[PDB]
Write an enzyme that holds these catalytic residues in place. Structure first.
Site, PDB file in Angstrom:
ATOM      1  N   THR A 106       0.826  -1.199   0.000  1.00  0.00           N
ATOM      2  CA  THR A 106       0.000   0.000   0.000  1.00  0.00           C
ATOM      3  C   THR A 106       0.863   1.252   0.000  1.00  0.00           C
ATOM      4  OG1 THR A 106      -1.982  -0.969   0.994  1.00  0.00           O
ATOM      5  CG2 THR A 106      -1.570   1.364   1.405  1.00  0.00           C
ATOM      6  N   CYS A 107       0.843   1.984  -1.110  1.00  0.00           N
ATOM      7  CA  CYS A 107       1.435   3.311  -1.136  1.00  0.00           C
ATOM      8  C   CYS A 107       0.529   4.241  -0.342  1.00  0.00           C
ATOM      9  CB  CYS A 107       1.616   3.803  -2.575  1.00  0.00           C
ATOM     10  SG  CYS A 107       2.546   5.345  -2.732  1.00  0.00           S
TER      11      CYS A 107
END
Lengths: 677, 146
Positions: A649-650
């Site tokens: 997850t950015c």
């Protein structure tokens, strides 16, 4: 057994002998290791009674209480060796305390016990004016104000007017070790010559200290072990916790404010020895007392005439308008902050409007227009963990402080009236609130490392940069490259020390800089706000009573709200691209899987996704990166079923493989989240 | 020597020692918002392109990392349409010792050797993992970067 008995005397001598180095962390680690070697044999552990008969408990208690090293150093040194044997060492201490426990259940003299029948057990009292006489079967709960409209003296001891009939006679009989059964037998004769709150049943006994006998060393070891920061695996003493539950089970002694001093001292001083519900019940019994305690015990009993005639709590209407809801609620909260009555909020019925009020104002306190909490500093509501920001010494900080006091009064009024709030307080906020209200402890921990790890739960970037400074406090050129002044980061308008706005930061004054920053974030910078919060909170009932909890445990009692995980909201706040479509079959299956989860499943999955135990205030829609599902493409020549989803997850991305089936996908999800613990 | 003076000292560093190719500077009288003009390497597939970046410093400019956003739309696995860049420096390897003259060089090297293992737009990473080079860079460079 000589090798397991006499060698403990030598170890005791080593602990008592000051010739043993106990200054650095290495020496303390060494002595912890040798203690572990002695205490844990190759066959079985040292039994509980053997530990105190040889004085080993005192031998190590004195060394951990009379050494001049920081608590952080000792905690690290201990947990470097005992981290894998916390319960193996906790069982010994709990057994020793169980053996050496001598505290007494100060009951009303049995009389069937603390059962259902123990509610309206009346007593005979013969009042005589000593300066005129009446004999009345007096209820054990009526106070010398609710009964005797003239000071009182029983056994030539002055009696507070606010106390009850029992509260003096029972203590008189106990303190001289009289019989515990003659109370119902003796006709005790007394010699004498805004809705008020009967919460004085501990205000005069706040320092009711009582010695623990030979168990003081064991209690000190337990307190130090708990303060080392380890989990709550086996800190609960089954014997002591059961005894406390029994004591609270008797309603007549508690309703008269005649709690034994050992209970109060242990709860206030050692709160890790009892289960959470026991401590919450203790708070319920000691904090608001009579008016609400009658109904609290009546609720348990129903699962009586005296209770229903002497425990009627009236309600006061509160009507507010939705336009000025926040301000009107705050002013009414100020006006009726400590009123013992029950307050229901009405919008201009029942639990509905008042729950809506307690929710919306808890939301409002989290905005940015009030400049109360620190912000992201780059949608009025704040999302991240909510924590006060340093004040301006020059600017008119009257409104911020007034609002903080309002927040304190609001939180107390909510907690007393069993309401549910929506705040996301940082645990450090309450940790500092505790260290402030605890006597003889500095609000800011003396050790630097504890302060750094305390801000690391507030602004992780700030903490990592400050730790970079600290770790590079001996390379002057690096400080010159940093080129900063003695002003608080995030607000250049406030300086650390007066006249430091132009003061360069270098190795000469690095420590002064760090101390200034720490005192400006945790201490002096926010001291006014914390003190205002404590004053507002204690306007209703003392904040000292809340020391029985823990920082991490009373965050939740305020962050308790039934979130919305309905299908419609999940759909309206979900994104699917880079391989997926919004009306995909797998997306619908994923939503169906998620929205039917239980309680702990939601929290585990949210921790796996974002890293927070729960989503910010307002539901999924408040997740600003707008949670997105991306089709995790199948590569590497193998099927997607065996692939385990990866977070990566950015911002809000969830790499979801195109599984050939729904149930295999759910199995992979349930597999991945558990290893995400 | 404050945070505002930290930005001022960075500006002085840029002024007295201009970068060879990737020039940058502030915008207007305001010191916070900036402008960067980086140029793709000649040997790189992104050669001959001028790119505009909108740099927005945080309040505590030397402690928390700055906001770097692309305004010139480009086609790259690690660059999104809004200009957000997923790089390690701006997230976890960040130190107050990292000057902007280093972060722009990091972006310059990123535009040469991409980061397929950590992509922002996955399909371009899928394409990258020979005509992929041309179909990724050339047309976008010609119609936007020039």
């Amino acid at each position: 057994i000589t090798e397991e008995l006499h060698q403990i005397e030598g170890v005791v001598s080593i602990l008592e002998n000051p010739s043993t180095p106990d200054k650095t962390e290495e020496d303390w680690k060494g002595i912890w290791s040798v203690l572990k070697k002695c205490i844990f044999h190759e066959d079985f552990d040292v039994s509980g009674f053997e530990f105190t008969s040889t004085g080993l408990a005192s031998s190590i208690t004195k060394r951990i209480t009379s050494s001049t090293v920081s608590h952080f150093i000792l905690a690290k040194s201990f947990l470097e060796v005992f981290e894998d044997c916390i319960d193996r060492f906790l069982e010994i201490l709990q057994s020793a305390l169980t053996r050496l426990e001598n505290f007494s259940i100060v009951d009303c003299g049995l009389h069937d016990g603390g059962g259902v029948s123990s509610l309206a057990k009346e007593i005979k009292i013969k009042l005589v004016y000593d300066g005129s006489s009446t004999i009345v079967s007096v209820h054990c709960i009526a106070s010398f104000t609710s009964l005797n409209e003239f000071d009182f003296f029983y056994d030539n001891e002055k009696v507070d007017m606010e106390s009850t009939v029992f509260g003096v006679i029972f203590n008189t009989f106990v303190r001289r070790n009289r019989d515990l059964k003659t109370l119902w037998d003796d006709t005790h004769t007394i010699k004498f010559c805004e809705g008020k709150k009967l919460r004085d049943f501990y205000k005069k006994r706040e320092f009711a200290q009582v010695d623990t006998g030979s168990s003081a060393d064991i209690l000190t070891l337990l307190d130090f072990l708990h303060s080392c920061g380890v989990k709550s695996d086996s800190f609960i003493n089954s014997k002591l916790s059961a005894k406390l539950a029994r004591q609270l089970d008797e309603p007549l002694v508690v309703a008269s404010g005649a709690l034994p001093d050992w209970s109060l001292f242990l709860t206030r001083r050692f709160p890790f020895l009892f289960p959470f519900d026991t401590r919450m019940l203790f708070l319920q019994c000691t904090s608001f007392g009579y008016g609400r305690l009658i109904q609290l015990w009546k609720n348990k009993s129903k699962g009586d005439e005296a209770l229903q005639q002497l425990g009627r709590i009236t309600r006061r209407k509160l009507r507010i308008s939705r336009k000025t809801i926040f301000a009107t609620g705050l002013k009414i909260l100020s006006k009726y902050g400590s009123s013992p009555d029950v307050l229901e909020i009405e919008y201009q019925t029942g639990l509905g409007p008042t729950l809506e009020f307690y929710s919306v104002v808890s939301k409002y306190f989290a905005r940015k227009s009030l400049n109360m909490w620190r912000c992201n500093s780059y949608d009025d509501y704040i999302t991240t963990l909510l924590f006060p920001e340093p004040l301006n010494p020059f600017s008119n900080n009257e409104k911020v402080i007034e609002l903080f006091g309002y927040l304190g009064t609001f939180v107390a009024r909510s907690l007393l009236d069993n309401r549910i709030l929506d705040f996301r307080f940082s645990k450090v906020f309450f940790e500092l609130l505790h260290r402030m209200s605890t006597p003889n402890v500095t609000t800011v921990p003396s050790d630097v490392e504890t302060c750094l790890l305390m801000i690391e739960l507030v602004d992780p970037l700030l903490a990592k940069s400050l730790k970079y400074i600290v770790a590079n406090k001996d390379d002057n050129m690096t400080l010159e490259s940093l080129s900063l002044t003695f002003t608080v980061p995030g607000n250049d308008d406030i300086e650390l020390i007066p006249g430091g706005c132009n003061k360069s930061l270098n190795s000469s004054n690095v420590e002064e800089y760090i101390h200034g920053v720490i005192d400006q974030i945790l201490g002096k910078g926010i001291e006014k706000q914390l003190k205002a919060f404590i004053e507002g909170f204690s306007k209703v009932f003392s904040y000292e009573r809340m020391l029985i909890l823990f920082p991490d445990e009373l965050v939740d009692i305020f962050g308790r709200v039934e979130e919305d995980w309905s299908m419609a909201t999940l759909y309206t706040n979900l994104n699917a691209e880079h391989g997926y479509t919004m009306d995909s079959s797998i997306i619908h299956d994923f939503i169906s899987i998620i929205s039917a989860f239980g309680k702990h499943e939601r929290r585990l999955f949210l921790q796996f996704l974002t890293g927070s135990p729960k989503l910010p205030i307002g539901g999924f829609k408040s997740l600003n990166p707008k949670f997105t599902v991306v089709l995790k493409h199948a590569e590497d020549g193998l099927t997607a079923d065996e692939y385990l989803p990866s977070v990566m997850t950015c911002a809000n991305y969830l790499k979801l493989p195109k599984y050939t089936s729904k149930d295999i996908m759910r199995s992979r999800l349930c597999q991945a989240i558990e290893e995400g613990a | 020597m404050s945070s505002s003076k930290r930005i001022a000292k960075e500006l002085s560093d840029l002024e007295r020692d201009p970068p060879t190719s990737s020039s940058a500077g502030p915008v207007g009288d305001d010191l916070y918002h900036w402008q960067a003009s980086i140029m793709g390497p000649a040997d790189s597939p992104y050669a001959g392109g001028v790119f505009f970046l909108s740099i927005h410093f945080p309040t505590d400019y030397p402690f928390k990392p700055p906001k770097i956003s692309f305004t010139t739309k480009i086609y790259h696995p690690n660059i999104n349409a809004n200009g957000n860049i997923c790089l390690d420096i701006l997230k976890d390897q960040w130190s107050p010792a990292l000057t902007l003259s280093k972060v722009l060089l990091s972006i310059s090297s990123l535009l040469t050797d991409a980061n397929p293992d950590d992509p922002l737009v996955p399909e371009i990473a899928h394409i990258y993992k020979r005509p992929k080079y041309e179909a990724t860079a050339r047309e976008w460079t010609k119609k936007y970067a020039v």
